[model samples]
Target: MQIFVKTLTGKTITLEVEPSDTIENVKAKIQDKEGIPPDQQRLIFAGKQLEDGRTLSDYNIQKESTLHLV
Candidate 1:
């Protein structure tokens, strides 16, 4: 599945992700693309902050879902 991550700069990054992928994994992908460190990234979905150990499936994230990255 694909997810959209919107950054503070208003750029949206499209990432191919699996339901089993953890937030930490997503952060690493972001780091790879944007050069931001995983420890410095924060993901927010549906107004709730996502945790590193939580999988996308745990948040009921679906294809094309958008998350705020800060």
Candidate 2:
């Protein structure tokens, strides 16, 4: 699924990821694409913060879901 991600700087972009992919994986992609290191990124979805220990599917993340990276 592709999710809509917004950065603190107000840049919005689309990221392609599998539902089975871990949040950590997504964080890594964020670091690569946005130049924001994973350690410095905070991914929030549906009013909840996502942890590296879980998968997007774990949070029931849907396609086009909006997430924020801070």
Candidate 3:
């Protein structure tokens, strides 16, 4: 599936990941794609940090969605 993610600076990056991807996995993926250090990044979904192990089914994610990091 392709999950759309937006950065704090309003940069949109579409991620192609399997539905079984773990939150930590996605976090690392995003960090890699955005070139941001994982240690300095936070995954915020709907204005909240994504739970440590949140999975695809753990949260309601749209195909083209927006998020923020700090």
Q: Between which residue pairs do clashes occur in model 3? A: none
lDDT of 3 by residue, 1-70 (tens): 7887778788888888766677778878887898877777777777667765777557776565555665
User: Model 2: runs farther than 4 Å from truth?
Assistant: none
TM-score of 2: 0.93
lDDT of 1 by residue, 1-70 (tens): 9999998899999999999999999999999988999988999999989999999999999999999997
lDDT of each: 0.95, 0.89, 0.73
In the range 1-70, model 2's lDDT, one tens digit per residue, is 8998899989998899999999899999888887888888889988899999899999989988888876
Ranking by TM-score: 1, 2, 3
For model 2, which pairs clash? none
Q: Superposing all C-alpha atoms, what RMSD in Å does each candidate have to the true structure?
A: 0.6, 0.8, 1.8
Q: Which pairs of residues collide in model 1?
A: none
Model 1 C-alpha RMSD vs. true structure (Å) is 0.6
Of candidates 2 and 1, the better by lDDT: 1
Looking at model 3, report the run of 10 residues with the lowest lDDT sum: 61-70
lDDT of 1: 0.95
